Target: Palmitoleoyl-protein carboxylesterase NOTUM
Amino acid sequence: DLRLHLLLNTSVTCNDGSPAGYYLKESRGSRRWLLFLEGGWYCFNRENCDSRYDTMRRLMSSRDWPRTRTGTGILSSQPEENPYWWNANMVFIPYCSSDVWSGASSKSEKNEYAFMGALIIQEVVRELLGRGLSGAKVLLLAGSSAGGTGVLLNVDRVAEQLEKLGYPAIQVRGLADSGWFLDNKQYRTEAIRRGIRYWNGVVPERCRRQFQEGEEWNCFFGYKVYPTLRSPVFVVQWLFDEAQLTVDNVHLTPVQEGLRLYIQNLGRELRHTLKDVPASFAPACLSHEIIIRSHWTDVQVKGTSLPRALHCWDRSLHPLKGCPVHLVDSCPWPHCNPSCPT
Ligand SMILES: CC(C)(C)c1ccc(-c2noc(C(=O)NN)n2)cc1
Ligand SMILES: *[C@@H]1O[C@H](CO)[C@@H](O)[C@H](O)[C@H]1NC(C)=O
Model:
């Protein structure tokens, strides 16, 4: 089990002003640290955030958080469930800022909600340094869905934070799961543009300098922000991600030619954006998220599982014979890979 710690700096808060926090299971015989960013969409104005506060309150407040959580998937400490990093120090950072981990704004007389996702990550890292992180060799910032996009937005800032604090030996890396989206045409960007304004959202500096004022929303799209990053980042993305299809207004419920071509083109476009991403795992499946699922070990691309690919990635950061790190399906329809989740 991972144990809850609310942030000692209580000015770093969830949406409603309650303290943010993290769940930790230490592994004193390890210098590897996995910090995982939870996902869960976002909200972008007063009315939609109010609605989220009524029925998704755990994503906006720590008041009801449990004292413990069970680590699953890549957060499991059992080698049978987690062949990759079972002995690591495990950190689960709950998503309670509704800002894709980008915000740096407090609750005030002018702001009903605080959007502090970028500051939550920084404060977690700072407080962990006093709990063993100061001795780390590798800090892997991982995350799923909105948390995967959060990795892309924050991994280089964590690296810069540790450098500035005097810890240049800690190697910061990212693992972005299900956070690599396309700003494509729907079958039948503006929400993020409005969100950034509402949240005081921040994006990585090199990407900000490319796109400039008013265009920072571009940096929430993996294929645009990834080339600007300096830290090594492994990208996990289903080719037919359900959240991508949802925003595209595709509801598979008789697939005629127009939709067939739309779906095939989506997979081809996603595959194209990953062509120059050397550490990636992109199976041809209709699904969403993978890394904290208990059966995350099951799917394979070209005969290689994700835990294996991540191990090969570790070796590459010390090509490798029989240990690949670039694993993108080429078949063009969901479940053309037999190992897809059923
Ligand atoms: C628009 C952008 C790239 C910021 C974005 C698009 C979709 C999601 C998203 N889709 O699904 C989820 C989720 O968090 N599921 N649990 N997030 C997050 C960000
Ligand atoms: C608490 O966090 C805020 C926001 O990052 C920061 O400005 C402040 O200095 C922190 N307080 C302490 C005591 O470190």
